[PDB]
């Protein structure tokens, strides 16, 4: 149906601004949202359609300690939207309490936008894990929606914070955030800072403004994942039809992504498939096996090569996945995009559930457990002191992520016939 976008936090509002500029340049519209005559499309999912065809986006903007939100405010794309929804620490409990006191009027903003929609499919939020102001607040509003609406979906695109370890309560905050993510969300798409750092240092030579190019890559991914919605396809034009195959189980619902060019400034279906089989073309860093993989391709493809390719892909066994049961790769095609120069013609996007990401969770678990053994790294800030006097929510989150990692490590096994 219709999908409502949400954005909060400094990194989330940055990537949302980049996503809307991406879809502004991508389709034939003005930076005030007037349709271009020279351009057909559906933009009714993420944009409300007006009478002069002002495709005003379904983007609710929440801010706390605004600095870059001011730069979003005075912009030549500030005529695209004005839904009148902008409403004003670096701790999880701080952002949790700040969202707690204003939950009513932001819920009025939610219900107003819900009344703006006739039907609904899902909520996306722009969020970053352990982002400071975003952390805790995002978990709180996730709790609010999960309490309020069990009839809809939530998709979440968020990055894993790694700054190569002044902030030492960051593993605690990310742990509590991911606890709410496993239990109160239905599907998670997670990425790494380090893998995008690798691809950025390979494709280019920039080190300091890396955030900006990260925003570009996030925008390309978020357009790619939505192309079968925005360009009219004929299958999985609901989100739940896309999500249904990849997630059999309500705790292992974390999805990793890839995209075939590292630098984007013929390719055949065989080439782009085997490139997409690499972890260096995947933007997330015993043998680990996928449960299921999905691929969507967009470009100038020849339809007869593709059956040749998946024949030979069976034959070489260039993937190694065996959960326990008959769940394999799903390949799909979307339209090569007009209204932009189509260079690097064929490009693919890849979506899988793989057990290896548990190791990265385990790395964070190893850090947090170490700090939990010392118990000197909450720094006795007053916010976490009010919200839990005994700090037992950290132990509850520890036992939940223990269940999660154990479910992961059992999910590797070909005896996962039971407990799936």
């Amino acid at each position: 149906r219709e999908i409502i976008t949400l954005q909060l936090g400094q990194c989330g509002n940055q990537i949302g601004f980049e996503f809307w500029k991406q879809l502004c340049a991508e389709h034939g519209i003005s930076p005030e949202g007037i349709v271009e005559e020279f351009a057909t499309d559906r933009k009714d999912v993420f944009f409300y359609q007006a009478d002069d065809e002002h495709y005003i986006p379904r983007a609710v903007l929440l801010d706390l300690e605004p600095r870059v939100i001011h730069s979003i405010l005075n912009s030549p794309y500030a005529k695209l939207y004005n839904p009148e929804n902008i409403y004003l620490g670096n701790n999880w409990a701080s952002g949790f309490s700040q969202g707690e006191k204003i939950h009513e009027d932001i819920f009025d903003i939610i219900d107003r936008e819900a009344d703006g929609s006739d039907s609904l499919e899902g909520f996306v939020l722009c969020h970053s894990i352990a982002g400071g102001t975003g952390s805790g607040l995002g978990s709180y509003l996730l709790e609010r929606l999960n309490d309020r609406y069990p009839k809809k979906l939530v998709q979440t695109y968020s990055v894993f914070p790694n700054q190569d370890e002044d902030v030492v309560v960051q593993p605690y905050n990310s742990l509590l955030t991911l606890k709410r993510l496993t239990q109160n969300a239905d599907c998670v798409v997670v990425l790494d800072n380090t893998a995008l750092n690798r691809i950025a240092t390979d494709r280019l030579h920039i080190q300091n403004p890396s955030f900006s190019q990260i925003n570009q890559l996030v925008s390309t991914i978020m357009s790619a994942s939505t192309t079968t919605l925005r360009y009219p396809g004929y299958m999985n034009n609901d989100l739940i039809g896309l999500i249904a195959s990849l997630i059999p189980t309500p705790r292992l619902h974390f999805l990793m992504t890839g995209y075939t060019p590292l630098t984007t400034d013929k390719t055949t279906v065989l080439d782009v498939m085997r490139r997409l089989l690499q972890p260096k073309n995947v933007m997330v860093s015993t043998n680990h096996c996928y449960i299921a993989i999905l691929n969507i391709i967009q470009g100038e493809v020849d339809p007869t090569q593709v059956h040749k390719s998946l024949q030979r892909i069976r034959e070489r066994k260039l993937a190694n996945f065996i959960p326990w049961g008959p769940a394999s790769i799903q390949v799909a095609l979307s339209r090569k995009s007009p209204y932009l120069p189509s260079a690097h013609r064929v490009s693919g996007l890849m979506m899988a559930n793989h057990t290896s990401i548990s190791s990265l969770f385990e790395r964070t678990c190893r850090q947090y457990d170490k700090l939990r053994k010392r118990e000197a790294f909450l720094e006795q800030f007053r916010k976490e002191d009010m919200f839990k006097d005994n700090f037992d929510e950290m132990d509850t989150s520890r036992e939940i992520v223990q269940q999660l990692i154990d479910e992961y490590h059992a999910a590797t096994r070909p005896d996962y016939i039971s407990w799936g």
Partner: protein, 264 residues
């Protein structure tokens, strides 16, 4: 040509996904008159988003047998009638075969409806972290996967490769033969052929078993384990019959490759 592709072969998005979806809300002592279905069609034509043409008009939608009778079987015939100098090319026998494949592709959409129905009944009570909840959810994943591979097969053969051999088929006499081969290579790869009649024959048993699976929520675990074991028995025989029908076809070669991948 590229209009009948969208409707008679259900290639447009949010048209089949709105027509069949409104149809399945009704199902029966209803659907007994052609004044409810022909307005449901008028509601689906609005949300097609592409079309809205006189080629998207003059469609005739009828049920050759009216329902006067585990059942998954339901018929529906969608046709488009063309003017007189083009009727000699697009005959009324080719459109009838288009309706014949229309009914089967319609009967596929009932499955992604009904499995979603039992998923949605379970969704509103998603509470208990026990073994009985997760073990149930696994059967749904197993049954959804085979649907998601058989639709991807249909969404390779009848709409992509037989459409690849139609944009390079075109040459007044040759145009009639070009349409007549477009239909023939579709019905060959559609496995409506009498050579491949058993493999199409087991698919109805698959459909009826997942409907009986859908009927219950809870009533009892053991009946669901039994229905799921019947599903697994039939799927175990399918992999043997599909390799046997290549020991005696290139389009059939991909089916066994699809249903088995990095397993046996």
């Amino acid at each position: 040509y590229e209009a009948l592709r969208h409707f008679l072969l259900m290639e447009d998005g949010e048209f089949a996904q709105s027509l069949s979806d409104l149809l399945f809300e009704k199902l029966p002592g209803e659907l007994l008159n052609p004044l409810v279905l022909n307005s449901v069609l008028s509601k689906a034509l609005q949300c097609s988003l592409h079309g809205d043409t006189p080629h998207a008009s003059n469609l005739s939608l009828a049920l050759k047998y009216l329902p006067e009778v585990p059942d998954v079987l339901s018929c529906l015939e969608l046709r488009y009638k063309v003017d007189w100098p083009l009727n000699i090319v697009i005959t009324e026998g080719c459109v009838s075969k288009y309706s014949g494949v229309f009914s089967f592709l319609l009967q596929l959409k009932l499955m992604m409806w009904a499995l979603k129905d039992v998923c949605f009944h379970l969704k509103r009570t998603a509470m208990a972290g026990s073994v009985q909840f997760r073990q149930l959810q696994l059967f749904k994943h197993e049954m959804q996967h085979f649907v998601k591979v058989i639709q991807g097969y249909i969404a390779n053969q009848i709409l992509h490769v037989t459409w690849c051999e139609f944009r390079a088929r075109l040459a007044l006499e040759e145009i009639q033969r070009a349409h007549a081969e477009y239909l023939h290579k579709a019905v060959f790869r559609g496995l409506l052929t009498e050579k491949a009649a058993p493999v199409m024959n087991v698919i109805h048993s698959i459909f009826s078993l997942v409907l009986k699976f859908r009927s219950q929520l809870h009533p009892n675990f053991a009946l669901m384990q039994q229905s799921y074991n019947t599903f697994k028995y039939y799927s175990h025989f399918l992999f043997k019959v599909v390799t046997k029908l290549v020991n005696r076809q290139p389009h059939l070669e991909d089916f066994l490759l699809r249903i088995n991948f990095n397993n046996y």
